[PDB]
Design a protein around this ligand. Structure first.
Ligand SMILES: [Mg+2]
Lengths: 109, 99
């Protein structure tokens, strides 16, 4: 029930869109779903969220899957990403997905 | 986007001294909250658990958590979590306890 986040390794060409999929569902809580990039030091930087730009988050028809996309990937977008949910029970806690890697490759001449 | 930042991510405190751990939050509208929750959650942790929110500093845009007389058990990583309506964000803080 932590969200899942796939693929674990996403490789695109610079200039193309890069799309991860986050999966999560709560029958008992609202809360917004967040998309993060992890810094060198390991701090999560909030990129976008649903429901709340270079980054786009959209809800697919089945209700529990979300596309999280870098709309036009740049070389410097390569890095570590995850999605997180929050719950209040039994205490306040972030539930981070497993972390996935984006690699943006140089487009040929 | 509602965001949380940590201007100081590492606290190094002498054993048995107090510490105030902090993270800031950024919003573009007057801070309407009693809509704000903040919590400091120890990663490793189990509860009487210890760090208490100082509510009076929320209008300054800070979530401050005080721990008295830190012990070996207080050492480790924490998530600073701030909720605003249904929006939220968090950062990691580390507390190290010297002798
Ligand atoms: Mg290039």
């Amino acid at each position: 029930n932590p969200p899942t986040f796939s693929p674990a390794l996403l490789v695109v060409t610079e200039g193309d869109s890069a799309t991860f999929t986050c999966s999560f569902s709560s029958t008992s809580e609202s809360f917004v779903l967040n998309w993060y990039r992890m810094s060198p030091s390991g701090q999560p930087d909030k990129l976008a969220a649903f429901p709340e730009s270079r980054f786009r988050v959209t809800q697919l028809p089945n209700g529990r899957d979300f596309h999280m996309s870098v709309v036009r990937a740049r070389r410097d977008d390569s890095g570590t990403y995850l999605c997180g949910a929050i719950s209040l029970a039994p205490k306040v806690q972030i539930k981070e997905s497993l972390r996935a890697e984006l690699r943006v490759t140089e487009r040929r001449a | 986007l509602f965001t949380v930042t940590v201007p100081k991510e590492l606290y190094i405190i002498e054993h048995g001294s107090d510490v105030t751990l902090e993270c800031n939050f950024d919003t573009g509208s007057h801070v309407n909250l009693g809509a704000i929750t903040a919590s400091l959650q120890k990663v490793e942790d189990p509860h009487r658990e210890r760090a208490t929110l100082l509510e009076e500093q929320l209008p300054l845009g800070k979530a401050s958590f005080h721990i008295p007389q830190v012990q070996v058990r207080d050492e480790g990583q924490y998530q600073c979590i701030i909720i605003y309506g249904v929006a939220w964000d968090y950062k990691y803080l580390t507390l190290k306890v010297k002798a």
